[PDB]
């Protein structure tokens, strides 16, 4: 009974969070009303990791929905699976955050954070054994970025020895709402470096390029991008939601993936990714070759530009485990130059019998690669391009912030890049 508390904040956070619960609720046989209608005992074996059990055998997601405007969360409630969420767990304001980190972290968000911690504390107080927290949010906006990290700061203060885990959508100019996104992301990255144990880096440019070039979607939408996030979030949490002995809990996962406290930013991956030649059976070697292809990775970082510190692979479906081991060892023994040699057996593999909805067998990729520094390098350059002219700063100084705080977050992330650089050699 190792419970995890889910928190989704802001527009991006709540729309991805919604699809995530929609996807896994189907894999555990939970319908939109919280009633179970599956056909296997494996679906309920670890059901209390993400769901509470109410009267009449109802399963209610252990999730807290947070936003500084009602808009997105009205869509969740009226959405398909909206009725499944605990009505008391909707915590929202009215002013909005204007894509402003300062408004989410210092002013608008500071006014609402305490009430969100009242729900967080309520869900935790009813956990037989709380593993930790997982947060879904974007870094480029105001609520999920500014208030999201403010929440992490205050959750660590109250639960200092629990695991803090985030799915963090990083912004890209190619898929952008506002020009201040590099500002918001640079301020959050420093928060995450300090106050999270695991951060799954998800670059909206990787999602767009995949939808466009691989999935052959002429005009991708946020929904198409979120479909990938759902499937990827379902994959990385397979270890946690089903019977297994490898990366079973969050802490054991961190213990095996984070050799250094600040380098805890992971590149996720998913295979197969097929456009609609979709009915073809996929072999284990194919599944493995794709899972390691940069085009199947969602941080927009070429792994062949850095080195892997640790890797966690999860294979889902009824397949040849003997054939999985050979193909895994084949990729390691065929490209051992891209794995650091001072961490013996830094590539682990897990199997799961229940495949995702609509696939005979899939594979999810969690990589802790030094190449992730390219992501922080892009953000740093975009930051400095504007901050060198103090462009758009008035939005933030007007909320109380000073230019110094920007210079420090700039220096913090450059340090982070430099730290990834020394371990790459």
């Amino acid at each position: 009974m190792r419970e995890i508390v889910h928190i989704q904040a802001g527009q991006c956070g709540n729309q991805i969070g919604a699809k995530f619960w929609e996807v896994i609720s189907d894999e555990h046989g939970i319908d939109p009303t919280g009633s179970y209608h599956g056909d296997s005992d494996l679906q309920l074996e670890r059901i209390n990791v993400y769901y509470n059990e109410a009267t009449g055998n109802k399963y209610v997601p252990r999730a807290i929905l947070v936003d500084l405007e009602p808009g997105t969360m009205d869509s969740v409630r009226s959405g398909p699976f909206g009725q499944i969420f605990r009505p008391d767990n909707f915590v929202f304001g009215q002013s909005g955050a204007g894509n402003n980190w300062a408004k989410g972290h210092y002013t608008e968000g500071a006014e609402l954070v305490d009430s969100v911690l009242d729900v967080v504390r309520k869900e935790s107080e009813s956990c037989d054994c709380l593993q930790g927290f997982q947060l879904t949010h974007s870094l480029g906006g105001g609520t999920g970025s500014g208030m999201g990290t403010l929440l992490i700061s205050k959750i660590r203060e109250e639960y200092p020895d629990r695991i803090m885990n985030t799915f963090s959508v990083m912004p890209s100019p190619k898929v952008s709402d506002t020009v201040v996104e590099p500002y918001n992301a640079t301020l959050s990255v420093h928060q995450l470096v300090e106050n999270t144990d695991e951060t799954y880096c998800i670059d909206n440019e990787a999602l767009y390029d995949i939808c466009f070039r691989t999935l052959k979607l002429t005009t991708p939408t946020y929904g198409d991008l979120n479909h990938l996030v759902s499937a990827t979030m379902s994959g990385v949490t397979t270890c946690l939601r089903f019977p297994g002995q490898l990366n079973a809990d969050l802490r054991k996962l961190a213990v095996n993936m984070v050799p250094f406290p600040r380098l805890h930013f992971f590149m996720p991956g998913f295979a197969p990714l097929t456009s609609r030649q979709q009915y073809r059976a996929l072999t284990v070697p194919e599944l493995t070759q794709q899972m390691f292809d940069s085009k199947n990775m969602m941080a927009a970082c070429d792994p062949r530009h850095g080195r892997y510190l640790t890797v966690a692979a999860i294979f889902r479906g009824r397949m040849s485990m003997k054939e999985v081991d050979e193909q895994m060892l084949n990729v390691q023994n065929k490209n051992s130059s891209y794995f650091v040699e001072w961490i013996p057996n830094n590539v682990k593999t897990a199997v799961c019998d229940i495949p995702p909805r609509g696939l005979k067998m899939s594979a999810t990729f969690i990589g802790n690669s030094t190449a992730i520094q390219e992501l922080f390098k892009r953000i740093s350059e975009q930051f400095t391009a504007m901050f060198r002219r103090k462009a758009f700063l008035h939005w933030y100084t007007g909320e109380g912030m000073d230019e110094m705080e920007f210079t420090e977050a700039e220096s913090n992330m450059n340090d982070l890049v430099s730290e990834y650089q020394q371990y790459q050699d």
């Binding site: 190792r2 037989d128 054994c129 002995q245 490898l246 990366n247 809990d249 802490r251 054991k252 961190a254 213990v255 095996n256 984070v258 050799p259 250094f260 406290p261 510190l309 640790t310 485990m321 003997k322 081991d325 040699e341 001072w342 961490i343 013996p344 057996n345 830094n346 682990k348 593999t349 897990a350 371990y423």
Partner: protein, 438 residues
Amino acid sequence: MRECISIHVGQAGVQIGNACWELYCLEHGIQPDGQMPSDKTIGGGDDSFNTFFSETGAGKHVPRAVFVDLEPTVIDEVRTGTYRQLFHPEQLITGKEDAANNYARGHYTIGKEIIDLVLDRIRKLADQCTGLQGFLVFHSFGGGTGSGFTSLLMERLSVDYGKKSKLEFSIYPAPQVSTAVVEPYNSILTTHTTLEHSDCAFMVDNEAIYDICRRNLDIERPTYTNLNRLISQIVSSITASLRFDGALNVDLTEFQTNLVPYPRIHFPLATYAPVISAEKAYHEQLSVAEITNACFEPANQMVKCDPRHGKYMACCLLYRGDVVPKDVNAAIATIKTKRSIQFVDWCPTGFKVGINYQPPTVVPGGDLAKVQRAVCMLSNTTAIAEAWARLDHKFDLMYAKRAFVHWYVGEGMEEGEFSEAREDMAALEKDYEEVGVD
């Protein structure tokens, strides 16, 4: 009659402990509800099997065992398993969250809070012992509980039961059945703090148990069930002298006298034969010479290494089944003439032989076939130092970058304990080379 208390620590110790006690019952004729028809002394008696089992007024035979795991999932299987009736709740101790594969977490953070509870339960078993010999401790090297909590339990047992012997059954880490990258850390950490507290330790390398399952049993992808059922056959062969009438290895003290001339070098290599797939149409039953010769094949050692390039300090042949001493000595003659068996000059070149006429008992429906005679050889070879070398090398690679060290320092352990434990291993490897190499 003197009693022996078994302690199972962590998931590996508990699941292996489950398979052994399952076997112990089949070998002594004890039913899952604890009843033993052959035992004519109801609720008492100082027989050889009473070293491992106590008796109640109702005639229930209760294993002299304690199971400890900082997470309740693995031990709950015992609470609701086939032999759920054998044990009472006092014997099964479970925490609520494990050591996250962190030695420091199992030894310090979590161990400090539950140690007094385990000792209390252990003391309860001791209070039924008119003459307690010592303890047999089952645990893994890689796990945070098996490595971290075991070392603390051993330190306290030496304080509470000073004069009592302590043997180990330790699972050496093998990547093929391991998803924890820091197991070299834990293994070396727990070997450092436990070395001065363990009188004799039988290491089992999962890598060796793994291949024996794929090679001899034709198991494509062995599971923990396959591994543990085979491991409990070896453990059964090692503990039989304590549970049956006999004159060799009759008490735990004899294990150290017969196997460990120098204290730090207390890791005897085990070699077992024959292992035959029960799914075979029907095997040709091997002879005494053939199974004896197999004891000098690397392919059936519990730890893969080359005894030809070490020196023997002791050697015990434990036979089960149709075997008479005349055949043992004849087989031994033909092996000296064809084998490289170099003893240390300060030790006689010989073999101690024990024969139990009851052939090996196989779990009905298991993977192992019934055979008419089997043997387990316990030899103290310097060759087993290869396992320490492998393990120390992996330690050096990670520790050179301090990778993962912050997880241990974050649980209150000082970084200096890493180097302290590593230098101890450097001395352990040195002691081996001083004894075997010229």
